[PDB]
Design a protein around this ligand. Structure first.
Ligand SMILES: *[C@@H]1O[C@H](CO)[C@@H](O[C@@H]2O[C@H](CO)[C@@H](O[C@@H]3O[C@H](CO[C@H]4O[C@H](CO[C@H]5O[C@H](CO)[C@@H](O)[C@H](O)[C@@H]5O)[C@@H](O)[C@H](O)[C@@H]4O)[C@@H](O)[C@H](O[C@H]4O[C@H](CO)[C@@H](O)[C@H](O)[C@@H]4O)[C@@H]3O)[C@H](O)[C@H]2NC(C)=O)[C@H](O)[C@H]1NC(C)=O
Ligand SMILES: *[C@@H]1O[C@H](CO)[C@@H](O[C@@H]2O[C@H](CO)[C@@H](O[C@@H]3O[C@H](CO[C@H]4O[C@H](CO[C@H]5O[C@H](CO)[C@@H](O)[C@H](O)[C@@H]5O)[C@@H](O)[C@H](O)[C@@H]4O)[C@@H](O)[C@H](O[C@H]4O[C@H](CO)[C@@H](O)[C@H](O)[C@@H]4O)[C@@H]3O)[C@H](O)[C@H]2NC(C)=O)[C@H](O)[C@H]1NC(C)=O
Ligand SMILES: *[C@@H]1O[C@H](CO)[C@@H](O)[C@H](O)[C@H]1NC(C)=O
Ligand SMILES: *[C@@H]1O[C@H](CO)[C@@H](O)[C@H](O)[C@H]1NC(C)=O
Ligand SMILES: *[C@@H]1O[C@H](CO)[C@@H](O)[C@H](O)[C@H]1NC(C)=O
Ligand SMILES: *[C@@H]1O[C@H](CO)[C@@H](O)[C@H](O)[C@H]1NC(C)=O
Ligand SMILES: *[C@@H]1O[C@H](CO)[C@@H](O)[C@H](O)[C@H]1NC(C)=O
Ligand SMILES: *[C@@H]1O[C@H](CO)[C@@H](O)[C@H](O)[C@H]1NC(C)=O
Ligand SMILES: *[C@@H]1O[C@H](CO)[C@@H](O)[C@H](O)[C@H]1NC(C)=O
Ligand SMILES: *[C@@H]1O[C@H](CO)[C@@H](O)[C@H](O)[C@H]1NC(C)=O
Ligand SMILES: *[C@@H]1O[C@H](CO)[C@@H](O)[C@H](O)[C@H]1NC(C)=O
Ligand SMILES: *[C@@H]1O[C@H](CO)[C@@H](O)[C@H](O)[C@H]1NC(C)=O
Ligand SMILES: *[C@@H]1O[C@H](CO)[C@@H](O)[C@H](O)[C@H]1NC(C)=O
Ligand SMILES: *[C@@H]1O[C@H](CO)[C@@H](O)[C@H](O)[C@H]1NC(C)=O
Ligand SMILES: *[C@@H]1O[C@H](CO)[C@@H](O)[C@H](O)[C@H]1NC(C)=O
Ligand SMILES: *[C@@H]1O[C@H](CO)[C@@H](O)[C@H](O)[C@H]1NC(C)=O
Ligand SMILES: *[C@@H]1O[C@H](CO)[C@@H](O)[C@H](O)[C@H]1NC(C)=O
Ligand SMILES: *[C@@H]1O[C@H](CO)[C@@H](O)[C@H](O)[C@H]1NC(C)=O
Ligand SMILES: *[C@@H]1O[C@H](CO)[C@@H](O)[C@H](O)[C@H]1NC(C)=O
Ligand SMILES: *[C@@H]1O[C@H](CO)[C@@H](O)[C@H](O)[C@H]1NC(C)=O
Ligand SMILES: *[C@@H]1O[C@H](CO)[C@@H](O)[C@H](O)[C@H]1NC(C)=O
Ligand SMILES: *[C@@H]1O[C@H](CO)[C@@H](O)[C@H](O)[C@H]1NC(C)=O
Ligand SMILES: *[C@@H]1O[C@H](CO)[C@@H](O)[C@H](O)[C@H]1NC(C)=O
Ligand SMILES: *[C@@H]1O[C@H](CO)[C@@H](O)[C@H](O)[C@H]1NC(C)=O
Ligand SMILES: *[C@@H]1O[C@H](CO)[C@@H](O)[C@H](O)[C@H]1NC(C)=O
Ligand SMILES: *[C@@H]1O[C@H](CO)[C@@H](O)[C@H](O)[C@H]1NC(C)=O
Ligand SMILES: *[C@@H]1O[C@H](CO)[C@@H](O)[C@H](O)[C@H]1NC(C)=O
Ligand SMILES: *[C@@H]1O[C@H](CO)[C@@H](O)[C@H](O)[C@H]1NC(C)=O
Ligand SMILES: *[C@@H]1O[C@H](CO)[C@@H](O)[C@H](O)[C@H]1NC(C)=O
Ligand SMILES: *[C@@H]1O[C@H](CO)[C@@H](O)[C@H](O)[C@H]1NC(C)=O
Ligand SMILES: *[C@@H]1O[C@H](CO)[C@@H](O)[C@H](O)[C@H]1NC(C)=O
Ligand SMILES: *[C@@H]1O[C@H](CO)[C@@H](O)[C@H](O)[C@H]1NC(C)=O
Ligand SMILES: *[C@@H]1O[C@H](CO)[C@@H](O)[C@H](O)[C@H]1NC(C)=O
Ligand SMILES: *[C@@H]1O[C@H](CO)[C@@H](O)[C@H](O)[C@H]1NC(C)=O
Ligand SMILES: *[C@@H]1O[C@H](CO)[C@@H](O)[C@H](O)[C@H]1NC(C)=O
Ligand SMILES: *[C@@H]1O[C@H](CO)[C@@H](O)[C@H](O)[C@H]1NC(C)=O
Ligand SMILES: *[C@@H]1O[C@H](CO)[C@@H](O)[C@H](O)[C@H]1NC(C)=O
Lengths: 440, 131, 440, 131, 131
């Protein structure tokens, strides 16, 4: 019986360190400087060494994984690093003598400043109804009395780029390869990796786009099912093909409220006056919704009913589908999707979408960003993989069950990609008794 | 980390493996060839990976085990640190569940390790050769 | 005779490295973000290991300790990090058509900017006489022609928080535990620590508040006593109980000179029109002052006289007692304290105090800060522990001796907490001859 | 640092103590779990604490004393490096006042240490085994 | 780096020289006693100089050559790694043109080095003393 030291024993503990970026280096010599990749993200490994772990029984926790918070912090930070140097839209909160455009969109007239200060600029522009409000009638940009408006540079894109969050030596990322994996608890098949897979920072509400795909059955994950306050997130197994288009052939006009302060606005568009919309195949949607009702009945009585209704109340991001599409921010009327009733036992649907240029996401009072116009008709397509549902709560139990779309927090989107990940720190110091002994 | 689920006797056959992925982070990123969030995150992570290594090699140094990955000592194993045999430990249990069983007394053993031998053995060793 | 290496010999030398912060982590989930603790200060050790050092004769030097400068640099830096993102008070230097309030305080009327730019804001406010000057008469904020005024955020507090400055491995902090310790020179009782004790960055002039307490006799420390240009600093052994109150029930009004630029001013106060003041127990003050005269006679003839007079000339910070009190800056008429004469052998006194909202401390031409108003009557209490005195200088020697309060530098306040500290670097490489020798 | 005021013979009984508080700064702050003054100050301090350690272990390495805290060498002690005896040095003086007496010739000794032995002894040792 | 152009036998007489200017960068700048370009550039350079050193000492450690600058091993030299003799290598060629001739198989040799001996020799060595 003698104590002995064994440096490098396969022993670890639960902790968290300072993770970092890892993205494949694309030159992009024509258009660079997206917010997430920045000037430099660490490159990835050409061969992703994924080592499986046998007889490893470990409990994962997605709803308490601090990596989601650290990502949510880095996202807001990366955004702020891309909004400071660009044009601070303070020489824009003027009285807008708007006329109804030939109704959303308005044709406004206003007085700004030229390259000179005393020399003022009598100019026009075109915006949406959710961009200005009245005080003919005179209008003012909505965020001029709340948060500081600042236009983003027309060079930095908002297209999501996959991020492979890693961990340094002494720390490891554990990946649970369980197909039928409830969000938390023990996992029979645990694997270890140094970095994660391709995760796109899809800033979207309700409908999750371009996310991960579950295996076999559509996985249902909620922190507490019987608690309506908890937001339920789903992960599909079959990606759909959704198409959103802004059929307005807009034009970009460049004014000079300088020096150096250039402002790009919306001029007389071409083509047709066609509002934003999206398309959903009614057959695949109805087919996918039926599989949802067959999966929701696993957390409810066998013979029951599942009711779908549109959004109740809240902001336009909580009620409408918020997402990016080529630079412009789209907000769609999802009422036509959620209006069905399901018991125990070839055209496409369209949704009216709105476009907003002055964004105030994350509800940060004090700062604001303006979306620069995008030329030509915009057409985007994605695969919807997740949804943020929400019960109604107080009612007679097991009678009827109603599910409404929610979006109380943006962190729920990062949970859709970090449900099978966990950071642990390696404790290589091992002490075990042996019949061996040292000298004198 | 291949033998993380094997028996301690079986696992003890791959200590170089745990030794490799603990110190070198400079093959994965010696530089990445500047106040971005990623630069600070990277630098603090790279420092920490060698910072942890230097703590463990420091403990082995002050315990007189600097050069070796496996060293035997003179401190007795007090049976209150759980009663088991050589075979019940090394051929039927993994280092994970073992480290959990002995995590309670690791501090006491470290205190005896640094004082009882490498400080009594070495001090008497200095007084013997320095004569 | 053979050279031998001994790694880790108790040998050190005089140097200085990059120290850092150490403060106990308080959640403060309701009100956070004080300037000094920032978003994160390193936590402290639960058990402050203080190891004494025997037979260690070492000379300390407080007047040449570079830690005081490094702290003074970090303070000014920490302040600047809290003034940049907040509101830049540039849309405030307007003509103020002020009327005498129903005399310090003025009820002014002016034209600002609303959330719109062309739409101007006809508003009122209330400030002090030391905030604006004339050009009825029209007034302008005092710092509008010198330094850039910028309001601090109403979320960052100015309350001092103890700081435990540490030193990394290879460096050590030596603590001299001598009770009767002259400021510099040898110290019989030297101890070593990795971090200092609780040091509050008490930004104050003349009267030192919430400082360290000396032992036994009131310690007198001056770089050169016979040099009147050198500021003499004292350290009491008995803390007093001073109370400063602003009995004005002020109100905070929120205007919108946005976008995002919100400004909080002073509206119609409630309660009573009561100016700022402080209280001092005349008995304990007279008792403490007598002990000072008994300690000053140790650096002067036995049978002499000590004369006390108010401040001579200089800025209002050099003449009046500058300090913080719940957010507002107070400046008190200390003439009633310093007006006594002492040879060899139950009411309280009050001091008229003034309040200033536009601060220009450290005399940095170019930058300025505005103190946001504080709601409700303010009441603060502290323990005065030190004083910055100053001789008059040129006069007939040993006739009479006069002492006046001074405050030429702010670093003198940091000397009151760093008089018994010293940073040294460890030289562990030791070479000594022994009869031992190596092999061949 | 308990024996900092003891005789060199008495002080030589606690070299692990000076060895501990020289390399590990990661127990006190492995991370503190970002451009604040405190972040840069902390990071530069943590790097310096291991930076100094690696310099001294580097010198012991190129002097052939890598594994040991106490090593004896072959270089003669020239009496001009002060005339004293074993007892007058190790049982009546402390390492502090000793380091002050020999601080003058530490550089010359280091030059001889790296050249005279570990570079002549090892080079002849390489030519002997490489034969 | 004086013997960079000498024969490998002649060059092998100054390995301390290459060892010195590889780890210590703290004599040139232990601190320089703050977001300037120079501060970040300096700090990243200082970390890299010890980061590279720790990678090589790490490889020597997992190869059982931790304490020594010159260690002999058990892995055979396969003649496909170029056919030469002791004298044609050590007394007529420099390490530069040698490293170019063997740069092709350095990876294969490293794989055998870590597996064939220090992992078979040590594992059998653990099973022999642990008996
Ligand atoms: C979920 O995922 C899907 C799929 O990943 C996302 O769909 C993506 O949407 C974004 C918009 O949000 C699109 O970005 C645009 O791509 C356009 C096409 O890019 C290519 O073609 C450009 C033109 O080249 C064309 O002509 C040549 C020669 O005839 C052909 O060979 C070529 O195939 C094209 O037909 C190229 O310039 C470009 O480099 C690509 O090769 C672009 O037109 C558009 O902007 C272009 O122009 C900008 C102005 O200079 C410039 O800044 C851009 O860099 C670019 O050059 C814009 O980039 C994606 O293309 C589209 N698909 C993919 C695979 O990403 C979907 O958006 C996502 N959902 C959400 C919510 O994000
Ligand atoms: C020398 O040292 C002395 C002593 O250390 C210093 O005296 C300090 O002065 C500062 C002002 O400069 C004071 O700060 C204020 O403290 C007030 C009291 O804080 C406590 O009470 C608040 C209200 O709670 C009350 O009700 C509950 C329930 O009935 C009671 O249990 C409780 O005891 C109180 O009676 C709490 O909210 C607060 O968290 C504390 O528990 C505060 O009222 C004040 O601001 C409050 O409100 C702000 C607006 O939201 C908010 O931002 C604040 O965080 C806070 O909540 C302010 O903080 C110190 O209290 C006072 N004492 C001490 C021990 O610090 C003296 O200033 C110093 N000299 C110099 C020159 O600095
Ligand atoms: C606003 O436009 C209307 C319509 O052209 C015009 O009658 C009115 O005078 C305008 N007002 C201002 C202030 O420009
Ligand atoms: C701009 O200013 C001119 C004169 O200053 C005025 O005639 C015109 O109506 C203004 N435009 C608007 C939109 O108010
Ligand atoms: C700004 O004005 C709009 C409409 O006039 C109003 O709804 C909003 O509440 C205002 N902002 C604030 C902070 O009150
Ligand atoms: C784990 O993987 C094995 C085969 O790789 C499979 O048989 C088993 O079902 C998996 N576990 C779970 C929970 O799916
Ligand atoms: C998922 O199911 C497992 C077992 O059925 C359970 O242990 C775990 O708590 C569940 N997770 C959640 C979030 O309900
Ligand atoms: C969910 O919340 C309800 C309260 O609405 C509670 O009764 C239930 O225990 C919670 N579920 C879990 C798993 O904690
Ligand atoms: C909008 O208003 C401007 C103001 O001059 C006018 O020239 C233009 O014809 C109007 N319509 C469009 C489509 O721009
Ligand atoms: C979206 O557009 C693509 C390309 O034309 C098409 O293949 C797909 O069927 C469309 N889906 C919908 C729902 O319109
Ligand atoms: C469409 O929905 C109806 C209503 O529940 C259902 O009866 C039908 O089977 C569904 N068809 C498909 C193809 O999903
Ligand atoms: C939801 O639908 C109801 C009727 O079905 C409608 O009255 C309500 O306005 C809709 N809500 C939204 C946000 O569209
Ligand atoms: C969304 O559509 C429903 C029915 O198609 C309609 O009742 C509702 O008013 C629409 N909401 C908006 C904001 O247009
Ligand atoms: C937009 O208008 C321009 C100018 O007529 C034309 O060249 C382009 O093809 C149009 N694009 C679309 C999508 O209508
Ligand atoms: C959507 O799914 C289809 C088929 O599963 C796939 O080919 C396509 O790449 C997916 N799109 C994205 C953006 O992942
Ligand atoms: C897992 O356990 C089984 C039997 O318990 C064993 O055969 C297998 O070798 C173990 N796997 C590892 C990696 O130790
Ligand atoms: C190995 O471990 C199991 C679980 O503790 C125990 O039941 C079994 O008896 C052990 N076998 C041997 C041979 O030690
Ligand atoms: C660990 O040891 C302490 C005292 O040494 C004892 O109180 C505690 O119960 C022990 N824990 C376990 C799990 O045995
Ligand atoms: C300033 O106030 C006085 C008193 O009300 C008034 O007579 C005078 O006209 C005012 N002047 C301006 C420029 O507002
Ligand atoms: C503000 O402006 C209006 C008209 O522009 C003027 O009547 C008023 O006197 C101004 N106020 C002050 C305080 O000068
Ligand atoms: C600003 O004005 C005040 C009073 O008019 C004056 O005392 C001060 O010297 C001026 N500032 C400068 C820099 O001259
Ligand atoms: C140092 O401490 C000792 C006892 O701890 C005490 O007797 C001595 O007076 C102290 N030295 C001084 C200078 O006070
Ligand atoms: C304090 O007194 C000591 C001895 O009386 C002396 O050596 C030292 O210089 C004095 N310090 C000052 C600042 O006068
Ligand atoms: C203090 O300054 C005076 C000159 O005013 C000088 O004569 C005296 O020597 C100084 N004291 C010390 C201790 O240097
Ligand atoms: C101060 O001036 C304003 C200007 O409108 C007036 O309404 C107010 O009654 C005056 N007095 C106070 C105490 O605010
Ligand atoms: C200050 O206020 C406290 C609390 O009422 C009291 O105990 C103390 O005596 C006061 N001191 C003075 C000088 O007013
Ligand atoms: C108060 O001051 C007077 C004047 O020096 C003195 O005679 C008296 O003793 C003092 N009393 C106290 C209690 O300090
Ligand atoms: C100091 O007191 C004298 C009279 O005692 C007075 O004339 C002078 O104004 C006072 N100084 C200050 C700054 O109050
Ligand atoms: C301070 O008080 C003294 C006497 O109490 C008085 O002479 C002097 O004018 C006062 N100073 C101020 C600035 O009020
Ligand atoms: C200040 O005024 C408010 C409103 O009347 C009152 O509730 C509060 O108690 C007052 N506070 C003080 C300290 O007078
Ligand atoms: C002031 O002194 C008293 C008694 O010495 C003490 O209780 C109190 O905590 C002290 N206040 C501060 C802020 O240190
Ligand atoms: C200090 O010196 C005394 C006598 O000179 C001795 O007894 C004591 O042990 C010494 N202390 C240390 C720590 O060496
Ligand atoms: C020890 O040192 C002192 C001071 O140098 C000296 O006087 C004394 O003789 C020495 N004693 C011995 C035994 O070396
Ligand atoms: C140190 O040595 C130099 C020459 O080697 C000599 O000039 C100097 O005086 C010596 N210093 C001491 C204190 O002996
Ligand atoms: C360079 O080569 C010449 C002859 O080839 C040789 O004499 C000389 O020593 C070499 N220099 C070095 C530094 O090896
Ligand atoms: C040394 O190298 C040269 C060039 O490869 C070769 O020609 C010569 O024969 C070699 N000499 C010996 C003795 O190896
Ligand atoms: C290096 O080796 C590879 C295969 O091991 C071979 O294809 C290649 O030609 C070799 N290169 C040289 C320069 O010999």
């Amino acid at each position: 019986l003698w104590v002995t030291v064994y440096y490098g024993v396969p022993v670890w503990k639960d902790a968290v360190t300072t993770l970092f970026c890892a993205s494949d280096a694309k030159a992009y010599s024509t258009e660079v400087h997206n917010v997430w990749a920045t000037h430099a993200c660490v490159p990835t490994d050409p061969n992703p060494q994924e080592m499986p772990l046998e007889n490893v029984t470990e409990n994962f926790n997605v709803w308490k994984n601090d990596m989601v918070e650290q990502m949510h912090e880095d996202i807001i930070n990366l955004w702020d690093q891309s909004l400071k140097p660009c044009v601070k839209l303070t020489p824009l909160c003027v009285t807008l003598n708007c006329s109804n455009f030939s109704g959303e969109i308005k044709n406004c007239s206003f007085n700004v400043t030229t390259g000179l200060k005393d020399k003022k600029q009598k100019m026009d522009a075109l915006f949406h109804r959710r961009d200005v409000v009245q005080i003919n009638s005179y209008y003012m940009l909505i965020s001029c009395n709340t948060s500081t408006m600042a236009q983003a540079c027309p060079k930095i894109t908002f297209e999501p780029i996959p991020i492979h969050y890693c961990a340094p030596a002494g720390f490891a990322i554990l990946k649970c390869k369980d197909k039928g994996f409830n969000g938390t608890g023990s996992c029979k098949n645990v694997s270890t990796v140094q970095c994660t897979h391709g995760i796109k920072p899809v800033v979207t509400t309700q409908l999750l786009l371009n996310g991960s795909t579950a295996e076999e059955e559509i996985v249902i994950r909620s922190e507490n099912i019987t608690d309506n306050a908890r937001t339920i997130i789903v992960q599909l197994t079959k990606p759909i093909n959704i198409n959103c288009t802004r059929p307005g052939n807009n034009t970009r006009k460049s004014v000079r409220i300088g020096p150096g302060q250039t402002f790009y606005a919306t001029g007389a568009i071409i083509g047709n006056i066609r509002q934003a919309h999206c398309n959903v195949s009614k057959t695949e949607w109805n087919d996918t919704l039926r599989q949802v009702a067959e999966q929701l009945s696993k957390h409810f009585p066998n013979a029951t009913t599942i009711t779908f209704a549109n959004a109740s109340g809240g902001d336009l991001e909580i009620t409408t589908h918020s997402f990016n599409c080529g630079g412009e921010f789209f907000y769609c009327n999802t009422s036509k999707l959620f209006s069905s009733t399901w018991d125990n036992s070839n055209e496409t649907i369209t949704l009216q979408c709105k476009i907003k240029q002055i964004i105030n996401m994350w509800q940060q009072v004090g700062r604001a960003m303006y979306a620069p116009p995008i030329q030509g008709e915009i057409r985007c397509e994605s695969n919807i993989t997740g949804l943020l549902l929400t019960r109604d709560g107080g009612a007679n139990s097991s009678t009827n069950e109603t599910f409404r779309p929610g979006g109380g927090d943006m962190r729920d989107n990062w949970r859709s990609e970090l449900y099978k990940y966990k950071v642990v720190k390696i404790e290589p110091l091992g002490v075990a008794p042996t019949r061996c002994k040292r000298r004198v | 980390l291949g033998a993380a689920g094997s028996t301690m006797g079986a696992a003890s056959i791959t200590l170089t493996v745990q030794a490799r992925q603990l110190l070198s982070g400079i093959v994965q990123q010696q530089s990445n060839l500047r106040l971005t969030v990623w630069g600070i995150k990277q630098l603090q992570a790279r420092v920490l990976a060698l910072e942890r290594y230097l703590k463990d090699q420091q403990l082995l140094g002050i315990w007189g085990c600097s050069g070796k990955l496996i060293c035997c000592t003179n401190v007795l194993w007090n049976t209150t640190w759980s009663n088991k045999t050589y075979n019940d430990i090394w051929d039927n249990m993994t280092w994970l569940q073992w480290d959990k069983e002995i995590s309670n007394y690791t501090d006491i053993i470290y205190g005896l390790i640094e004082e009882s031998q490498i400080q009594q053995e070495k001090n008497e060793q200095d007084l013997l050769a320095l004569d």
